[PDB]
């Protein structure tokens with residue numbers, strides 16, 4: 001049990017760099033822990049100690065309480081918006097001040113961690129939405145993998161009519177809304193103001209609500225989509241690439257991965273980037289900062305990125321990982337790894353505002369739930385969302 005190996009390693013260690021994370025289980029936790037085990041074996045009297053804090057929400061709550069207690073870890077996972085918050089407390093060390101080489105890091109990921117031209121996180125476990133599908137059910141009715149939004153809606157209506165149930169499955173959440181929002185032309189910032197109730201937002205939440213009404217879209221309200229498979233016919237979902245191993249373990253059908261449906265066949269749809277960067281806290285000792293620096297270079301190494309990404313479905317964050325021969329041997333046998341990397345080229349982010357975490361869940365996520373689960377009018381729901389977000393941003 002890797003966490004027991006680590007406990008051993010950290011008992012013999014004079015310097016311990018804690019890494020707080022939001023991995024609850026599955027291949028993400030196993031892959032992170034095996035990376036830490038390998039790192040700690042190459043050290044003398046130093047170690048990284050991974051500390052699970054629950055999910056990502058629990059992680060941000062515990063880090064906020066750790067600032068209030070004056071007792072922060074050396075390292076933590078953080079979304080771009082949590083970085084924006086931690087920078088208000090001036091709590092983060094610039095990554096290049098530690099001497100970490102960032103050559104070859106995907107500019108899409110590195111751009112997203114740059115604040116005032118300064119890098120404040122290391123892209124580590126970065127995910128892109130993909131189209132998951134049931135290869136067996138598409139073949140069953142002679143439906144091609146949809147390459148456009150128009151094709152995707154047609155195929156969902158057609159398969160749902162043949163199978164007697166809604167076959168496009170979705171969580172009624174900010175993450176899923178962002179796929180429809182972005183690919184119908186929407187943008188959250190207008191002249192620097194945050195806007196949740198633009199016509200593209202209404203149009204996106206309307207298309208989901210219409211899907212449920214019309215019997216082709218199924219809201220999943222208890223657990224992840226991959227925890228609901230096996231009850232009812234499933235054709236498609238739009239979901240994190242980091243769900244890959246979870247879909248594989250649950251599916252009693254032949255699982256497919258495709259690039260997202262776009263406006264036209266000229267380009268795949270944009271996917272929402274999720275997963276986290278590693279930050280290093282100023283309050284960490286020099287010695288703890290030197291462990292973090294060596295661990296961040298480890299995790300950016302082509303071999304660590306190849307193993308991590310092929311174990312999980314996360315996007316390798318470096319050009320070097322794609323040339324690593326362990327990556328190439330898995331990719332030669334499994335085209336899904338190339339599909340995920342191809343989708344990572346068509347990538348959008350939610351806004352990196354200090355307050356975004358609270359807005360995405362308690363305000364925008366609530367509006368999407370009211371519209372889908374209580375049939376609130378999309379516009380009235382999003383107009384409330386806007387007002388709640390302006391009041392929060394004002395305060």
Ligand SMILES: Nc1nc2c(ncn2[C@@H]2O[C@H](COP(=O)(O)O[C@H]3[C@@H](O)[C@H](n4ccc(=O)[nH]c4=O)O[C@@H]3CO)[C@H]3CC(O)(O)C[C@H]32)c(=O)[nH]1
Pocket residue numbers: 022023024026028056057060079081082125126127128173175224226227240241242243244246274275276356357360
């Ligand atoms: N706190 C906070 N969360 C945020 C923010 N922006 C986006 N997200 C959340 O990132 C999750 C995506 O991050 P990702 O690393 O791609 O995927 C996660 C898991 O989601 C996914 N998972 C786990 C278990 C399972 O059975 N199935 C499965 O797919 O595996 C990974 C490790 O747990 C979304 C999902 C969400 O948690 O509902 C809310 C979303 C933010 O600003 N703050």
Ligand SMILES: [Cl-]
Pocket residue numbers: 230231232233
């Ligand atoms: Cl069944």
Ligand SMILES: [Cl-]
Pocket residue numbers: 252
């Ligand atoms: Cl079956």
Ligand SMILES: [Cl-]
Pocket residue numbers: 384387
């Ligand atoms: Cl109101």
